[PDB]
From Swiss-Prot:
Species assigned in the record: Homo sapiens
Free-text note on domains in this protein's UniProt record: Forms a beta-barrel structure that accommodates hydrophobic ligands in its interior.
Function, as annotated: Lipid transport protein in adipocytes. Binds both long chain fatty acids and retinoic acid. Delivers long-chain fatty acids and retinoic acid to their cognate receptors in the nucleus.
GO-annotated biological processes: brown fat cell differentiation; cellular response to lithium ion; cellular response to tumor necrosis factor; cholesterol homeostasis; fatty acid transport; long-chain fatty acid transport; negative regulation of DNA-templated transcription; positive regulation of cold-induced thermogenesis
Residues recorded with modification Phosphotyrosine: Y21
Gene Ontology molecular functions: fatty acid binding; hormone receptor binding; long-chain fatty acid binding; long-chain fatty acid transmembrane transporter activity
Domain of life the protein comes from: Eukaryota
Stated name of the protein: Fatty acid-binding protein, adipocyte
Modified residues (N-acetylcysteine): C3
UniProt keyword Ubl conjugation, yes or no: no
């Protein structure tokens, strides 16, 4: 019952500061424009100890599965090859990606009826809000 309140299908409703986040990550111009335009559906499910997160959009359809605290290799939608670890910290899903000596942290939390996604790369944060689909 670890992630019950995250499970379901969620649709993007707002984004702020996201182009600047992606710049900080090192995403190139054309990918920033098309990815920034994406309006993903995020599908979160749990089966035993395995969490699956899918992001479906006109840009890319991506899927990760993982166990909390257990690192994995991830290919991001912008083609970074990263080492990822996802944990639950005080009810917040915390996703850290490491690559090329860089690090970004993506936090997902339930707030009211929303799923709020905070994306941080150095001093740049972007806040994205999802609603139930
Ligand atoms: C951290 C951020 C990364 C970002 C994806 C979105 C997202 O995961 C945040 C979110 O879930 O809304 C996106 C736009 C679907 C594809 C391109 C990236 C760079 C991999």
């Amino acid at each position: 019952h670890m992630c019950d309140a995250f499970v379901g299908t969620w649709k993007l409703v707002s984004s702020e500061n996201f182009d600047d986040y992606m710049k900080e990550v090192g995403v190139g111009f054309a990918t920033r424009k098309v990815a920034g335009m994406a309006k993903p559906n995020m599908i979160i499910s749990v089966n035993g100890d395995v969490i699956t997160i899918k992001s479906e959009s006109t840009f890319k359809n991506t899927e990760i599965s993982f166990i909390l605290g257990q690192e994995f290799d991830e290919v991001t939608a912008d083609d970074r090859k990263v080492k990822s670890t996802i944990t639950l910290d005080g009810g917040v899903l915390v996703h850290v990606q490491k690559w090329d000596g860089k690090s970004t942290t993506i936090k997902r939390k339930r707030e009211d009826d929303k799923l709020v996604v905070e994306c941080v790369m150095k001093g740049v944060t972007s806040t994205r809000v999802y609603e139930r689909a």
